[PDB]
Amino acid sequence: RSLEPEKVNTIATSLITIFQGQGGTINDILDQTAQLTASLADRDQAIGE
Amino acid sequence: QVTRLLADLGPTPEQPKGPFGDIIESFADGFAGKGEQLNRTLRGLSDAL
Amino acid sequence: TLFETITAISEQVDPIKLNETLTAAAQALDGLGDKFGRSIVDGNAILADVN
Amino acid sequence: VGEQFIDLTSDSGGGAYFQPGDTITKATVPAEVGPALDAAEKGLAVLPKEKI
Amino acid sequence: KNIEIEPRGSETLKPRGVLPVGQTSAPYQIYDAFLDVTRNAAGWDTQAVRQSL
């Protein structure tokens, strides 16, 4: 019942349209957010105060 | 239909493990040792949000 | 040989862990899948106005 | 279990009709069981079970 | 085919007793399973699925 053709085809085409060549973009997002959140978390005591 | 799906989604000379073998290998190696970290990140994000 | 291969595959699934993983994933979006997509579109508009 | 036969399929279902002694050139044959079993075994044996 | 009975409750069913329709279930036929899997797999865009994986 979960192997219905319409849902599988729509999911597959959408995943293709979304992740086509976006490895570099996602790597950049991960690195930038890692650096920003580490910088913000180094001020845990400051934010608490 | 069985023959068609086994031929199209099966191993090929260019892709020795096939699409499913490649995706499970990439997910097993790309997420090795990140179970606890992902759990903690998801819990913290859920709490904050 | 086919039965031996299927058995070798099936001995690795360990249905307890698969069951809890699938239950968590299903509860994650049990009734909000159109809401999340509308959220992504809304965030797209937000970033298009903020950047 | 068996009981082969031959089916004459015409999507149009009309038009010119075959004459006695003629020959039908377009034909098809089902996928054999041996190739399907081989394909299944190959496609299952390549999956890395330890990675699963 | 065969019928399986799971007894429940403390009351005893008298002869010529009728079980409720809500306490009875029908099987999932093997031909239904083959029909479902084959009709679903026949609509797949297999190239798109392979590309997505």
Total residue length of chain C? 51
CA of E39 to nearest chain B CA: how many angstroms apart? 9
Nearest to D46 among B4, B7, B21 (CB): B21
Structure-token match 């999507």, residue found? D11
CA of E8 to nearest chain A CA: how many angstroms apart? 31
| Interface residue of D33, D49, D50 to substitute, partner C, most C CBs within 10 Å | D49
CB-based contacts of C12, cutoff 8 Å, min separation 6:
D49, D50, D52
**What amino acid occupies position B21?**
G
Angle at E38 between CA E36 and CA E44, to 5 degrees: 105
The residue among D48, C5, C4, C13 whose CA lies nearest residue B17 is D48
Across the interface, whether the CB atoms of B9 and E47 are under 8 A apart is answered: no
B28 vs D: CB within 8 A: yes
Please tell me what resolution, in angstroms, this structure has: 2.9
Across the interface, whether the CB atoms of E48 and A12 are under 8 A apart is answered: yes
D40 vs B: CB within 8 A: yes
Partners of B12 on chain E (C-beta within 8 Å) are none
Using CA atoms, how far apart are residues B31 and C2, in angstroms rounded to an integer? 30
- Between chain C and chain D, the number of residue pairs with CB atoms below 8 A apart is 19
Task: Name the structure determination technique.
Answer: cryo-EM
CB neighbours of residue B7 within 10 Å:
15
- Compute the Cα dihedral for E26, E32, E34, E38 and give only its sign: negative
SS3 C22: helix
SS3 B4: helix
| Interface residue of B2, B3, B6, B9 to substitute, partner E, most E CBs within 10 Å | B9
Do B18 and B12 form a contact (C-beta atoms < 8 A)? yes
